[PDB]
Point group: C4
Chain length 290, copies 4
């Protein structure tokens, strides 16, 4: 009795990512790559998912929602779940609590008008926080997050109020020689993010980022994702194995192929169940309450 | 009835690239690499193309035209198409509309005196824009561009006048929470650029660029280009598959070899037709007008 | 009669690394990755070591000691050696001699209260010095270091007092055209660090570091470690082959697997003896005194 | 009748490289890696060369000469050629003509006192120029250089006096829209440098360099060097194939192995002749004068 819950979470960065994270603000050429993600990328992923009768979760920035209305329709009509992901993919930590709350508000209503239901799930743009737990909870609806990394392949409840001492070399060592102090567990369930299961850093060329990659090969990345599944399957009876992808990157033919190899491999395993993130949270909320 | 139009577009960066893009301005050693591209690199590619009875398009910067006159003759005499690519490979977006127009003017007359005909095609240096659509059209001749990335393996007509709201954290979220607004379709046909089909970023060492690579292997890159062909061939009946290369990089023995494997692989496929970019634009203009 | 002493040295950077070296100070998301290292990472490595009845040395920052008390207990109870590694993983060279001495003091007493014995070994955070030899010696206990790189696969005694002339282009060449002047041999034994046998640089994504990697594949790294063993085994009769790893990186399923291949390979060789660093120093102190 | 002249040029950066190029000035830990290059690195390469009865050329910085006197003796006694490479590996282009001349003077006399003869060959540290042609010639002895990149696998005579127009966006396009103007051929013969045949950039980790690599695998690099040999052998009857290496990197067991594969491969080819750089210049001076 092995139950491995595997899922694809699709972050639709498209133009919003270049506006909010990736330095493409003033680059007609980058913005053009954003338009590819929405207009050409979204449909290719939907083709991929349908070919394998797969469900999925789309974390769609408001901007992407209002900029690719025809593709948004295509996603809702497939029965896929829609989660929040900012408006212009702004890093939550560079905003005021007001700015960040106005963005969260705006995203909620965008997704409600589009789908009928309010979104249950959230992904922080570029994967930041600050006091997002507070708002995801305050801002109702939000049942789970997929931005944090306290864990690997098991969900968990997010503690709010963790604290730590930064180093200050203008002071004496005892002033900062203190441990991190864990806060208190909340009801926000975390389906963890993982840099090792994210297609974008390794495979998207970002000219303005000193840390850019983009020419790591789909085959080395494909193999690494499989390696992680193999271990997890071997060492766990209950695990959730979620993959973060973007149409910006994963709708490119060479990585489209990569996913076909990943999907076919996973489907050779028994106990595997493809789901959406909301179904992972629901199951976890039942699997162990409090 | 599968028609896959595949083409090699050769950007002759040589010395111009180091002067305009790659930080080699004050580096005798870099400039020396530029002289290799023109004097030794150009002939090696011509040898490659002739061995496989391949046509090709060369996007030659003015500077390269006036600096390698003997090699320019070798290219014209092979019957290859010549497109524009700046003078000293200056990024269009750092120029005034006047500077950029004087460069365009100068390039046009350089290519006309060299070939007899004015150039029909253009590639923006390092792949920028600004209001280049306007000028490529205004500046007559220009029938197509190969700098933008709204699409993959299908050409398209370039809309001018797209607009978007940048993020300003000095303002309130509603001030920038707006979609991108598409402009209006022009007659400039785009045969799209693609970082995943460009030899330079992965394989040229650029000391002054924090984002430099240069030691990614021709074999991982070769494989990635093939992977893209394989998918495109499998999933499309009409597609254009163009590769951007530079004598600076692709005339190096280890990547010369890489292309022989790529070319031999493509030639095993039926429906494949090697062409020049101008022939791709002509066919597209007919394949679907307006 | 071949004696190859091979060891795993585990640097528990966890949260301390993000606080002291890796720029994660103000990143809830990074700090969350630090918590993974301690809470989830430490136990996984212990599982790995136990599966192969391997001993090991853990270089635990004070911060990690006071932040993961339950996991610290799990390590001591396995019989593994505990060495120093700062408090908040602060780079020794950015501290005053007082700051650096207070950190050393504090680490010593932390490790003594936890284990009963004072630590014999030390690893400089991020691998710096300054006048650490002086203090490792002064601060008693410290019998060996694993931060320096004068050598490969043979330990040695650390000279204190080496000097060299820096270049100053405001002066005349003869002012800095002088050799490095070796100081005098101390009793501090060095079991050498090696970037080619460190899991973190190649495989941890560090957003704030221009020099970040993180998407190099475990299989290419695995192969490189093996390659080094193979040569050493082939060319030496007495050598010490130590690997630096972090729960932050090596407790990730894809590199967990990498180690199983490394361990199984090494165990196919005769003359190989798995030990702790303290046992390597003891043996070396006897193997050749002075 | 195929004559392929292949050679190993060893740049002994050791401590000088960290002092002059690689940012290791204030890093005891880096300097320690420099000491490895000289003390442990030099002998390992000599072992490599002797195993295959190979000749070689060592470009030794003055600093390295005066810092590793025992290893210098080992090199001279093997019959290997010694060329110049600065004192503290200072980039020629950051110096005054006086500073650069004093360094050249000092290097000449260092190498003369050590070997008896003055050096015939030179490599610019980190591969710069400025008006080095003038001095290599003026400063007598110097018959050849191995810093420039006008060509691949054929030597050539260095033109002095090349000029080009830099871009200035404060001016009008016509002010810089001019070609490069070739100067006049000198007698300095160039045995060309090549980033694609240099072990250091891909495989040495340099913390202070944003462009650092260091975890590219010896096997991908090994294969790339071989690929270049294979093409050159296939396409040329007379070529010189020289490899630039450093004890800092190539004396590391995993790349030591890489070279054994490279050497064994080259030795399977007929027409191949292992030589020193001086022998390559002598042959070229005769092969075609003027
Ligand atoms: Zn995103
Ligand atoms: Zn170009
Ligand atoms: Zn550490
Ligand atoms: Zn050097």
């Amino acid at each position: 009795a092995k139950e491995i819950l595997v899922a694809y979470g699709v972050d639709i960065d498209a133009v919003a990512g270049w506006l909010g994270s990736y330095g493409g603000e003033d680059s007609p050429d980058d913005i053009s790559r954003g338009l590819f993600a929405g207009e050409v990328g979204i449909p290719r992923l939907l083709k991929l998912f349908k070919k394998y009768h797969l469900p999925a979760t789309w974390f769609v920035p408001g901007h992407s929602i209002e900029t690719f209305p025809e593709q948004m329709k295509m996603i809702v009509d497939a029965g896929h779940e829609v989660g929040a992901h900012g408006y212009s993919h702004e890093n939550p930590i560079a905003m005021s609590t007001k700015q960040e709350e106005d963005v969260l508000l705006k995203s909620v209503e965008l997704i409600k008008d589009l789908t009928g239901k309010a979104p249950t799930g959230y992904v922080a743009p570029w994967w930041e926080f600050s006091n997002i737990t507070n708002e995801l909870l305050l801002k109702h609806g939000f049942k789970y997050d997929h931005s944090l990394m306290h864990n690997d392949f098991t969900p968990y409840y997010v503690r709010v109020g963790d604290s730590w001492s930064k180093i200050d070399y203008s002071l004496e060592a005892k002033d900062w020689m203190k441990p991190l102090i864990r806060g208190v567990e909340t009801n926000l369930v975390e389906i963890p993010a993982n840099w090792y299961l994210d297609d974008l850093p390794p495979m998207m060329f970002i000219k303005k980022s000193p840390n850019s990659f983009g020419f790591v090969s789909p085959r080395d990345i494909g193999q690494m994702w499989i390696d992680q599944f193999d271990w997890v399957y071997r060492e766990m009876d209950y695990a959730v194995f979620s993959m973060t992808i973007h149409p910006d990157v994963s709708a490119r033919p060479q990585v489209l192929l990569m996913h076909e190899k990943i999907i076919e491999h996973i489907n050779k395993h028994e106990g595997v169940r493809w789901v959406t993130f909301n179904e992972i949270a629901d199951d976890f909320l039942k699997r162990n309450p409090r």
